[model samples]
Target: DVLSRMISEKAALHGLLNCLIKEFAIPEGYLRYEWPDEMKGIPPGAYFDGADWKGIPMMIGLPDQLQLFVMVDRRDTFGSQHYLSDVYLRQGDWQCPDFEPLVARLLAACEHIAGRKNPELYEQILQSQRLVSAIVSHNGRQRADAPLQHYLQSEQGLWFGHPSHPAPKARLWPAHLGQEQWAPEFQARAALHQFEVPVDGLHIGANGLTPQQVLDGFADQQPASPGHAIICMHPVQAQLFMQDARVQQLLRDNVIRDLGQSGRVASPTASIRTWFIDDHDYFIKGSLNVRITNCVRKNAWYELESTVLIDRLFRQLLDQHADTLGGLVAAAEPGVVSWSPAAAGELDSHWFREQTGGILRENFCRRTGAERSIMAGTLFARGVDLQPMIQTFLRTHYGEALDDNALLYWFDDYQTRLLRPVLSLFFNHGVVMEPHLQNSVLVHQQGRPQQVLLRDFEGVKLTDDLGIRYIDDDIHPRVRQSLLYSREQGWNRIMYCLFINHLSETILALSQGRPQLAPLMWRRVQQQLRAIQGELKQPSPELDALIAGHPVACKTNLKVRLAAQASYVRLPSPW
Candidate 1:
């Protein structure tokens, strides 16, 4: 039981350590703990570091394992790195047998960081720990003979959750939310909290489908009212929304009518808030107050507009560069439907209004067929250890005859299909796409990467020229700012998501237990970058700096927590 639970605990610790090392600029080399005169060697609860970083000590352990140690004492709680407080490490690869102590200590440390008065900080750590245990139990029961349907197996197979987030598996606020009841990792299918609103009580912004078409698509063959709008929401979110007085008032006034929930259940994707309904061409992304990693999951009104606007921009882009962009496609978001109350103003109801909106996005499986596409994020999910999985795929596709040449060919093929399109969009078209593991979908035929489908237009950014050239519709002022990034900002977003976060994680997984091949894999990346540069008719300044060994942006998760802000740091090039 302890071993099973530790699997989840260590995943969170790994993320915490990964964040700390990157954010604190800690070196990998080992150092002796500097004991104060009153404190001796390996003091059970002591922290030991110099003044820089406010005396928060650093920890180093064997690769692929976490063995976090103590932190040095400090005068000010905010001045010190409380997340690292009270940690203890064992001697070597065979380390501490239990994780409860470390989990408890870190919770205390984070609570101290939150001034100990804030229960929310303490709850996050404890809540994540609990979810981790639930994941372990769920995986254990379904460990053998889990379904092999490519789309769902890949989605539910991510039992270990995010590699570098402090609380990757955590859900929100409901003190006793069941993991099997809702989370994708638990192999659960649930009925969506669907409803109908009077036509005048809703808003629709769309491109491909009319508001009526979008509603008709979701009607699921039932006779939806001619004068009403249709929507599907998460069950948990439905309960929460009903608690709001404004939402209750709207329902009471018959402006919105509860059509009850869906009779047809759907699979929740890796993203807890998004659901894949059977027979539906598009996925329904609902507003979830559930705080997963960074931000509360709510569809900002501008995000709706941004999706439609970017969808329009993407089509125009594809039309102009048809020859250049073969096999490149955007899971473009062309529509969003929102619930609004007829009696209240926009800002009057707060989260009730924000949380009531739903986004309709092109489902990747619909584009790539259900069996061919898998999420790129699956590569780094704990327990998946995608290198072995890829090897198995190679064997299945190519049989017993395989060589290093086969491996090289496979890697090169994947990078070409995946990496080239992203660079082309950024340099040639001045479009920035977030192809991080989650947003990217990998399509494979016979165990080789055939094409890559990119999603999530909310992070899709445009160059100033294109932003001006394509003002076809009225975009909100804030949404425009959100979509546009400065040269520095745009390049950083593109490179970090493409190379550092996405490619590096994939490469590291492939390189594990085969360290010598690391150089060869990276060399392939360099060759691809150079080839794209050579092919471009005009020079790309961002690509030049990226390939020239200049720094790229790295996300600062720990600092984001410390300052209660979201930002990234410019760090040295990984390649």
Candidate 2:
């Protein structure tokens, strides 16, 4: 019975140990120590001379009488008197997670590798012991004691960051406008591009046209119409249309080439439409009902209204991308599409009802729409949105009325409070809406932000694009964070809206004869930021750059930065 019980105990202990050690075992290098084989109970009457018994440890004593033998010499023990190889004890040990030097060496080796060998197994141990090495600092500073739970989702992959999302603050809140008609017309257009058509406006299809033969075939004879119905076919459409060429030309001469060369590509968004319309070719290529709230007029606080307009514009632009559109084109498969909360709400307001009607109408023909959407309506995705925060609002409410000196603090606050929720989504889900002021709107009941009824996908981004340049497979139980993609442009979309457009003006308004509620509102905003920062990993210089435009010390003005680069290239810069 004792023998059987010993075997059972060993098996159980080994099982638990195996789960902890994972693929990383006590390799040959580390010293392993053993105490004298202690036997009692039923084995109390037996002993043996040194002999290899079963395939395990051998007995080293004569038919024993309380005598002992050590598996490993005591002198070999580095310090303590236990098996030294099974776990990393001292901080100096290369295997210890807190060994920064060893970690640095591992990172140097790992730089070439994007991901670890085994992610799932590693995460199990990682999550369980994530906070094992964490530290909490009362002052504003960096502490690496805890395992990072907030991971950013980038195009390339996932990386740990702070958890953030829009909150009660207007400039910090992102909107949720998906595929439903209730989504702003500009946003819908932003995603679908010129490809989709509202029910009110229909484009002629190529269904009944004769298939062209060569790559240059036109009308053999005039049909009922003059222009051809360009589409996505091979030889036939290729000839008469030259569509791809035209699209390429449009993108190059119009958007991509121009924007890319600027070296300041902004954030990207999505849209769903029934047809693709050329921006310049408005006659038949574009729709009639695609009306965006043109919030252009401004004098003093005009930027506030413009912020709302800017969000609309970004969404409109995305609506016109190659994919992420609507109608039959978006129906290749069944998947989630961005939508709005107002899908079912029936309001008597003329404008609201009209907007709703227009959107609902499209849902019938294209048979495509969404239940809800999430939007990150700010420039904090670039980290600069905090610079233009309404100081008056902060001071009025929270008495945090420092001038430009507190810009960095404000930025950190914004990132910690707002950006964390949005960015963390990228790790948990493949998508995240990088916030940008007006872009971050929510339809809700009251003061509580966590009570989000729906979230917009308007600003969600992939990890690949955000610089999940490296991957660690060691953390299995915890969530994985590395992703793949680029965010060079995502940076811009967020900054313009959040800081420059929204936060800037809000503060300006408060600076002037602001409302009494402004101070109270700002206090809540401060409290929220503090609450979120409690969960964040703190803002760093490199992270600031990763999040947005050129730093002030580096270059106060980006236009100047572009000009300098242009001088070097001898290329006449457009800006």
Candidate 3:
């Protein structure tokens, strides 16, 4: 069982710690260490912390692992009082069997550094430990032998979640919430809760599609009253929404009819709130009150509004620059649907707004006949290293295990497919993509990456003044700032997400079998950027700085958790 596979990823935890040290520019020799046990697998001797090149801590550990962990409890870098009192420690090289006594020493360091205790921080660490167990036991099984289905193979593959996040799988909700059944790992499929509201009380933000076109095709069943239209949501949302007095009164007065749960069973995708159902043309991204990572996965009304406009903008861009766009595919969100209630007094409708909205996005992968659309995050899934997946792919494709030359060729092709479109879109069209692992996918045909499908317009940014202005006209105020960024802000966002979060993980995965090839892999990337720069006569300073090895911004996850907020740090370039 995975539970006993405690060979906890002391390495991964150490890597995360190293990222913090590097980001903060903490001189590695600032702290020293000794193997309290001098255990076989653990480090063997008293040494300058993080000084040795052959050590995992050298790559990701700080000089003072204990001291760094303790400072978090004291420093209010996240600008809040909720300091981290707990640190997760792994037993060995792999990421299981979490060790607490070691973590206590790290936590005690924080008390030693900051001179205080952080109960709230301690509680989160416990939540993280428990959630990690759930994640492992439920989804950590090696499923390389499973059927190559579009949903499960990729969605459930993230058994160990984000490689660098201290608590990537942590969910604050309890088991009684029933959200687990719908989790991608569990592979459970269920019907959505359906609703019927008069057309006058329903709001539909659509482009090149009618409300009837959006809602009617989803179901064969009709509303009890033809005058009303249908809307659907996660079953849990339905239960929670009805509890609002405003919604209650509307239901009582028949302003809204509960049609109950109906429709084809759908499974949640990697993006937990978004769902996949067979025979459906569109992927439904609905609002869920659950907090997955940093924020609650709710579709704010403004996001609902902007998705439609952004879809239109993308279409217009493609039509105007088809030659430049190439094979890039931005999953189109044709429309959004939500309920409107006229009966209310100063009810502060924000909750209602976020609770009701859902977007209808086209399944480009299915339409293109992609054998299996795998999430980029799945490629870096722990327990099943990239080496196994690539080995199987090579055997299936070329009837042999991957060799040195073959690995280089494979990574070159893969990175080419992933980077070209993103660069083209930003450099040529001024549209910045969030290519973070979660937002990225490899659309495979027969067993190779034929397309890189990038989705989620909610975070797609625009830098050019004209493009920003055009989008600004239609964007909702609540989400307008997020949709547009100045060149500096926009470039940083792309660099962090593209290089650090996405490509770095891909490199790490490929290097598992041949760590020496990692440098050549980065060089291949440098070659691609040079090619792109040559193609564009007027390359921006951002691209220029990129080739020159400027530090890319890094998201400080632990700092964010400790401060109970969000933040970033510019660290060394991956190159």
Candidate 4:
């Protein structure tokens, strides 16, 4: 049945795809193709990540199956002009002249489903501008009518958002791109790899765990973990995303915007990759991505007082919590950080200023003329790259042929090899990597690879032993109170922050590979959990409570948001 279906489906699929091309007359590689030999009869870019989904090779999904996408930060990827352009390019070819308009209409439909009114003005403005350099202008309109950068290509080097963000983003490399250099087997279009479900496939709504579906006996209580915390790509709708313009047009715009806004970069130094996913609910139709702040000190949201302390604390937390954050497990990226201490609100700037010698004030008073603009921008400035390491990996491992399964599989391998050890060590040895996917970037050299730059120190954190070396063990009284006297209303923060927020998502992604990677990760986690099952060395009952599950290093969620301490933390569930 699969063979026959493949035959029939390929025929119609190819024909319909061909029609889209013929309708627009774009080049072959313009749409990206795949032909991996390992998977026979595969269109291209197809690999199996042990997950339950299958999809097309060029993109990331397969036929007649659903896909499980890992969550990513989207602060910077959303709302920016580049995000819009990225989506437009991926939705290549045009049988529909009013496609952009249609995209807006569809987006409106999605919002309407979410009980919101459509902002038709935004779509009208996009068309009126008639920007987007890649597209042909009709009616003899001058091509040079100041081509919109978003239209012409903001991050010309970045193929797509998938590989541009964190390490795992390197899937579905565009045909005209390179891999992570270290590994080579990727290929696709603009780095967008995902699961491909069938257009007429089945729907297991809410994983059969909606708020209304709890068992009779369990109705009075809640699951240890939230049961409805899951998202699955629809088989049929996923397929349509690859071959249908209507969906592509709508998705490319809204989804990319959402991911970009989430500000979840793949690494501290890679080109930011924006992610987009649609929930299965008919009434809650819409796309989501990330939001990013501008690259300058003043333009950045980190300048705000409350945010400043929190941001610095975030970096410290990353350094100390790297282990628990599962930076060693899936190693996909970093999760939301609590960047605050009583002394600092949401962000901390004291140490930052002292370290950088007030670089923040350097250009703050400078004139904003042409000279400043010309001299202010840096090509390899730590964090502004468009296509960083994640793409490099995709280019290396997946080459110019990829699929949803292949991408997920590649990520699984990465997690198993590197992430697993890091995560295990964090909980066991009190070491953390603080891998905030947002502040990372992956660089490449022409015909080769270069650096994996990590920046943004506002969120760095360290262990208590490490923190102690910086100052008195009990100098910061505010920090002492928060750590030793915090409430136990919800899950112990030490447990939730590292395990639930970081490790769980990573395990989900790795598990998508050939076999579940969770058990492998779990083996290490359990080992660490037993290491500090009940040991609190310092003078604190709060920490004693924390040590009940495992030994931890670091005084967590301190009041000085920007300060670090020299204590270790432990975790329970690992894999």
**TM of each candidate vs. truth:** 0.83, 0.24, 0.83, 0.28
lDDT of 4 by residue, 83-158 (tens): 1010111122212223344334333422332344434333322322221111111211222211111111212222
Q: Which 10 consecutive residues of model 1 have the lowest summed lDDT? A: 73-82
Worst ten-residue run, lDDT, model 4? Answer: 77-86
Ranking of all predicted structures according to lDDT, beginning with the best and ending with the worst:
1, 3, 4, 2
RMSD per model, one decimal: 7.4, 26.9, 6.4, 23.8
> Which rank order by TM-score, best down to worst?
3, 1, 4, 2
Error of 2 at 320 (Å): 32
| Position 106, candidate 3: lDDT | 47
TM-score of model number 4: 0.28
Which of the two candidates, 1 or 3, achieves a greater lDDT against the reference? 1
**Candidate 1: which stretches are off by over 4 Å?**
27-97, 103-123, 141-149, 220-223, 349-353, 384-388, 401-403
Pairs in steric clash, model 3: 6-97, 8-94, 8-96, 9-94, 9-95, 9-96, 18-60, 70-109, 70-110
Off by over 4 Å in 3: 2-98, 104-122, 128-135, 138-151, 217-221, 343-350, 384-388, 464-466, 472-482, 564-566
Q: Write the per-residue lDDT of candidate 3 for residues 1-575, one digit (tens) a residue.
A: 45423423332344344434533433222322222232233332322245642222321233334322221211111111111122323334322124555545444443433345555555555455555555555544555523233544676556556666655656555467664676676676878888877776566777888777877545444644777777888877788788778788888888888878785578877777788876688888888887766678887777777777788888887878776764577788888887676443223445666787878888766666634677778755444321225445445766677677777887788788878888877777777788889887777765566777888987777775534755655446656765667777777788878777877777766655455777787889888888776765345667888888876677765556555313786655546
Query: On a 0 to 100 scale, what is the lDDT of residue 50 in model 2?
Result: 46
Candidate 3 has its poorest 10 consecutive residues by lDDT at 74-83
Count of clashes, each model: 4, 126, 9, 154
Compared with the true structure, all predictions reach lDDT values of 0.64, 0.23, 0.62, 0.26
In candidate 4, stretches whose alpha carbon ends up further than 4 angstroms from where it belongs are 1-97, 117-156, 159-413, 429-455, 460-575
